[PDB]
Design a protein around this ligand. Structure first.
Ligand code: CHL
Ligand code: CHL
Ligand code: CHL
Ligand code: CHL
Ligand code: CHL
Ligand code: CHL
Ligand code: CLA
Ligand code: CLA
Ligand SMILES: CCCCCCCCCCCCCCCCCC(=O)OC[C@H](CO[C@@H]1O[C@H](CO)[C@H](O)[C@H](O)[C@H]1O)OC(=O)CCCCCCCCCCCCCCCCC
Ligand SMILES: CC1=C[C@H](O)CC(C)(C)[C@H]1/C=C/C(C)=C/C=C/C(C)=C/C=C/C=C(C)/C=C/C=C(C)/C=C/C1=C(C)C[C@H](O)CC1(C)C
Lengths: 220, 238, 219
């Protein structure tokens, strides 16, 4: 395994030698040679698309975590009102309000306007500092700053920094694909994805996705 | 100058202006005479060039050849779809006992009691499990679609869109240069027509929920009452 | 401001490096927002500028054509049907499509003939946009002039560029408003000035969060 250069692990393996793009060399992390749609021909579109991919990846990682750890954590102990992720916004409208750990003494969140207003105000300057400038650094790598973001300092040697970049982008593409799976298997079942996992593990042959295949057929 | 039998096109030997209307700058365009500025990269050397890149997505030539690949593959898939959507309904109106001949409900036939009878016959396919069907589909399609991009047992160094060797042109219609260049634009025009018609199949299945041949019969019976506008009130937001 | 390298940008004070190098301030409303890089190629930039201004003018025309029957329902005429996502059903009524509630003014019956006359006029006037015609011939396809400006407000080029950036800013606000009309028609089911009447009745409950629950699957 190399993850760079011309002999890299590619998305079709043996079927990837004639498909492989001429604009897609072995430079950037995660380049499996997959631009069959042709959307990275000029390098600044590829730069904005790599930035888009890494930001969507790093958001979908924490999105999958905030998806399954309420449901798994409610399965272990610590019961909630609406433990599933895609009813989790409805806990503001509850008579007891959204709570972080469910207990009544933490936050007492009854307002949706205050939370949304505060997070918009703080993330305006946060994502603006992400775009350019900021007190933690201005002219760094805009996708991989480091410095005031690395208390442990795992970007010391360029070899382990490069392999951390490729496992970052691979875990993030897995998280984006699985978050797409969370999105679609929420709406075809109406039930939680960990509860979908136990439903699949109870009956693998007939409680799979194909039981919900006749659901979306149009009426009349 | 020109006599009557040449204007009808009796003699297929002296036809050299046949590709002049589909290739080169003096070809037909998308808005006809109401399309003056053809995009300067769509020079007409490719089949299906009606000068239409209004959204400008195909200015770069690499993106343009990838979009040409996607267009021809989607064209052939939609051609096979629009032939394979109506023909169960055509054979059900024939009298062959297909039990759910509409295409948008044919996938649920494998969840029946007797499985998936192919032409309504247990002597045919009679597939029960959707799981082994999708498994052999993903194995066979992985092999075929991986052979497609970089060659394989049916041609290795051939063209990625038009191989035409001993396996993909076995009848040999594309031996001639001009006949191949004419049937290329014939192929992509029939494929764009079938892509438009498959989009029509999708929207017709969504908003009506009946068969496309049932939609054709309900438009042939009442054209002015049973148009697309009598189902325009079906997505009103209450 | 509004042109050149020292113009108004989309992040404002935090917009000195995120703006792309190919978005130089010569085209109207160049706030430097190409965060997906889709207009990096100049032909993509020109075609997307054409799509943006045409979508802009169609959106502002659609915004006024959607809200003015609502303001006239406030004013006092009843039309055939005031609600813009139920406005196409006037031609399906028994009395037909009366324009201002007047049965002797339009009284349209056939929706198929309305679509036929509509496509026969609109295909011609949309194909005339590309390569001139009776109005113009070979002008700027985004800013023709000389037949669609009977008053002719494009005399001074500084005021012309000012009106250009004013047009494209009103147009981005208009597509914003039409997207809002689209996604608050489907979640509420009431007209947009009627949603304004709800939000002015009680401002803290008649929000989008009153209807933020209705799109859960729930088996
Ligand atoms: C040699 C065999 C081989 C095959 C068959 C594949 C298969 C694939 N790999 Mg690959 N790989 C292979 C070798 C290898 N891969 C990888 C590592 C990777 C990675 C990291 C990735 C891939 C990805 C892909 C996909 C890219 C093409 C595509 O998008 O399909 C398009 C066609 C389909 C997806 C059809 C299959 C689905 C199904 C049959 C149809 C569904 C029908 C629905 C019912 C219709 C929907 C209903 C409507 C109403 C919405 C494809 C599925 C990419 C991927 O996972 O994308 C999802 C990807 O990110 N591979 C390695 C390690 C180096 C390989 C080693 O040899
Ligand atoms: C991060 C993205 C995000 C997404 C996709 C959602 C969507 C959801 N919210 Mg949530 N929210 C999100 C963040 C936020 N919400 C809220 C405030 C609320 C409230 C008060 C409520 C919800 C509810 C819901 C859930 C059910 C509503 C629905 O239509 O289900 C169908 C849709 C899905 C299951 C998601 C499918 C994916 C999505 C359609 C595509 C994602 C791409 C988007 C187009 C991009 C949008 C983000 C933009 C702004 C950058 C669903 C999980 C309701 C709920 O939980 O009760 C049942 C509810 O009452 N949200 C705040 C403040 C957020 C901060 O960002
Ligand atoms: C000082 C204010 C400030 C605040 C409140 C944030 C807030 C955030 N940044 Mg950050 N940033 C801030 C300054 C800056 N950011 C960045 C560049 C980035 C990047 C590339 C990313 C973030 C991401 C994040 C999020 C994850 C927390 C984190 O970075 O762990 C430490 C969080 C919303 C991540 C994100 O949004 O995905 C979840 C992300 O990928 N920031 C730069 C450029 C050097 C900054 C300049 O000072
Ligand atoms: C000179 C007159 C002339 C006109 C007006 C057109 C018109 C058109 N041709 Mg062209 N052609 C013309 C001459 C010629 N064409 C062709 C050969 C072709 C081909 C091969 C193709 C075209 C296509 C097109 C379309 C390209 C633009 C588009 O996609 O519009 C799209 C927008 C509209 C059509 C308007 C929207 C429809 C409706 C009126 C409004 C919406 C109504 C709904 C009720 C809205 C409700 C929906 C809600 C829910 C959202 C356009 C309709 C392409 C096509 O068919 O694309 C569809 C195409 O592939 N033409 C030749 C032979 C050389 C011509 C010779 O003179
Ligand atoms: C200094 C602070 C400052 C910041 C941080 C921004 C940044 C912004 N400006 Mg701005 N500007 C700022 C000052 C100025 N601007 C401008 C001129 C402009 C213009 C002309 C424009 C902007 C626009 C924008 C927006 C572009 C990014 C975006 O689309 O949001 C992306 C992030 C989100 C959408 C997150 C939304 C928040 C919330 C989480 C949503 C809730 C999520 C849902 C619940 C989930 C959905 C559920 C399911 C069902 C799908 C953003 C708010 C553009 C705009 O308005 O686009 C909309 C625009 O056209 N600015 C000027 C004049 C010089 C400024 C003065 O200083
Ligand atoms: C392209 C702009 C355009 C858009 C976005 C729409 C979209 C709409 N039309 Mg409309 N139309 C449009 C142009 C046209 N329509 C119509 C003829 C109709 C009819 C007859 C009806 C609609 C209806 C609708 C609405 C229902 C769809 C929805 O989800 O809510 C919605 C406002 C329906 C409606 O208003 O609900 C009662 C309806 O019955 N439209 C014609 C004449 C050919 C148009 C011309 O281009
Ligand atoms: C990689 C993350 C991941 C994981 C762990 C799961 C796991 C699961 N999904 Mg989710 N899903 C995913 C990704 C994932 N899916 C993605 C990317 C999509 C979008 C296409 C979906 C869409 C989806 C729907 C719509 C549904 C599920 C369901 C399920 C459950 C039953 C399995 C099933 O029906 O197959 C569905 C699997 C897919 C559609 C594709 C997933 C990709 C896999 C990893 C590749 C196939 C490998 C497989 C082991 C070999 C199959 C052999 C043969 C059948 C072809 C199971 C818990 C069902 C459920 O809730 O059960 C109760 C259900 O209704 N999933
Ligand atoms: C009617 C549409 C149509 C047309 C005109 C063409 C035309 C062409 N194709 Mg394309 N093709 C199409 C549809 C079409 N194709 C579809 C749908 C597929 C996918 C199955 C393909 C797959 C394909 C490949 C893989 C190759 C071609 C090749 C060719 C060329 C020579 C073969 C020929 O002349 O066929 C003329 C076509 C007809 C006369 C249509 C007859 C339709 C029959 C009677 C119906 C049978 C339907 C059948 C059951 C479908 C399942 C198979 C020519 C440019 C070859 C080439 O370029 O060689 C240099 C080549 O390599 N095409
Ligand atoms: C140079 C070599 C050229 C080879 C060309 C390919 C020849 C292919 C021959 C047909 C093979 C199909 C068999 C598929 C598996 C079936 C297994 C099975 O269970 O069978 C079971 C079936 C019987 O099963 C019956 O099927 C019927 C179909 O309607 C009914 O439904 C009955 O109810 C059912 O009992 O047995 C057969 O049909 C075997 C017949 C094979 C020969 C058919 C006549 C063909 C003779 C001419 C061949 C022409 C070749 C050129 C044309 C093709 C060009 C590509
Ligand atoms: C040109 C241009 C130009 C400008 O400038 C810009 C723009 C506008 C962007 C552009 C345009 C574009 C377009 C139009 C697109 C479209 C497409 C389509 C429609 C496709 C289809 C597509 C379609 C398709 C694929 C289809 C396919 C089909 C298939 C597979 C099959 C199916 C089937 C069948 C048999 C039946 C059974 O039962 C089942 C199934 C399975 C269901």
């Amino acid at each position: 395994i190399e993850w760079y250069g011309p002999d890299r692990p590619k998305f079709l393996g043996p079927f990837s030698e004639g498909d492989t793009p001429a604009y897609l060399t072995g430079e950037f992390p995660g380049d499996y040679g997959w631009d069959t749609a042709g959307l990275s021909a000029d390098p600044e579109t590829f730069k904005r698309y790599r930035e888009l991919e890494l930001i969507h990846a790093r958001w979908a990682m924490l999105g999958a975590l905030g998806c399954i750890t309420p449901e798994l954590l409610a399965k272990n102990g610590i019961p909630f009102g609406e433990a599933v992720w895609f009813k989790a916004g409805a806990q503001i409208f509850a008579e007891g309000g959204l709570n972080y750990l469910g207990n009544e003494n933490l936050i007492h969140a009854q307002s949706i306007i205050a939370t949304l207003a505060f997070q918009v105000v703080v993330m305006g300057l946060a994502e603006a500092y992400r775009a350019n400038g900021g007190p933690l650094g201005e002219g760094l790598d805009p996708l991989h700053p480091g410095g005031a973001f690395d208390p442990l300092g795992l970007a010391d040697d360029p070899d382990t920094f490069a392999e951390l970049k490729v496992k970052e982008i691979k875990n993030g593409r897995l998280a984006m694909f699985s978050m797409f799976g969370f999105f679609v298997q929420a709406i075809v079942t109406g039930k939680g994805p960990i509860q979908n996992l136990d439903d699949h593990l109870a009956n693998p042959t007939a409680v799979n996705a194909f039981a919900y295949a006749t659901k979306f057929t149009p009426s009349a | 100058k020109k006599t009557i039998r040449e204007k009808a096109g009796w003699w297929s030997n002296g036809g050299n202006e046949k590709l002049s209307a589909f290739y080169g700058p003096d070809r037909g365009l998308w808005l006809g005479p109401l399309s003056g500025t053809t995009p300067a990269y769509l020079t007409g050397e490719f089949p299906g060039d009606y000068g239409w890149d209004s959204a400008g997505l195909s200015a770069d030539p690499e993106t343009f050849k990838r979009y040409r690949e996607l267009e021809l593959i989607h064209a052939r898939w939609a051609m096979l779809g629009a032939l394979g959507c109506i023909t169960p309904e055509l054979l059900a109106k024939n009298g062959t006992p297909i039990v759910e001949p509409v295409w948008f409900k044919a996938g649920a036939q494998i969840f029946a009691e007797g499985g998936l009878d192919y032409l309504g016959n247990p002597g045919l396919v009679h597939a029960q499990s959707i799981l082994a069907t999708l498994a052999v589909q993903v194995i066979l399609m992985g092999a075929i679609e991986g052979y497609r991009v970089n060659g394989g047992p049916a041609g290795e160094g051939l063209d990625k869109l038009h191989p035409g060797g001993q396996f993909f042109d076995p009848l040999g219609l594309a031996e001639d240069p001009d006949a191949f260049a004419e049937l290329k634009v014939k192929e992509i025009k029939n494929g764009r027509l079938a892509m438009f018609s498959m989009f029509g199949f999708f929207v017709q299945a969504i908003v009506t929920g009946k068969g496309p041949l049932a939609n054709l019969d309900e438009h042939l019976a009442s054209p002015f009452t049973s148009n697309a506008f009598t189902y325009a009130q079906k997505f009103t937001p209450q | 401001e509004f042109y050149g390298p020292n113009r108004a940008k989309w992040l404002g004070p935090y917009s000195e490096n995120a703006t792309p190098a190919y978005l130089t301030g010569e085209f109207p409303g160049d706030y430097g927002w190409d965060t997906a890089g889709l207009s990096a190629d100049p032909e993509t930039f020109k075609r997307y500028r054409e799509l943006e201004l045409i979508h802009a003018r169609w959106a502002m025309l659609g915004a006024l054509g959607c809200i003015t029957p609502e303001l006239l329902a406030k004013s006092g005429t009843q039309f055939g049907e005031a609600v813009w996502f139920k406005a196409g059903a006037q031609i399906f009524s028994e009395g037909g499509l009366d324009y201002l509630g007047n049965p002797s003014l339009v009284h349209a019956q056939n929706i198929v003939a309305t679509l036929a006359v509509q496509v026969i006029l609109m295909g011609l006037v949309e194909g005339y946009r590309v390569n001139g015609g009776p109005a113009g011939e070979g002008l700027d396809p985004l800013y023709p002039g000389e037949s669609f400006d009977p008053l002719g407000l494009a005399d001074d080029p500084d005021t012309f560029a000012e009106l250009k950036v004013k047009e494209i800013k009103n147009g981005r606000l208009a597509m914003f408003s039409m997207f809002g009309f689209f996604v608050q028609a489907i979640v509420t089911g009431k007209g947009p000035i009627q949603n304004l009447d709800d939000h002015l009745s009680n401002p803290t409950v008649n929000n989008a969060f009153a209807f933020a629950t209705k799109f859960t699957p729930s088996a």
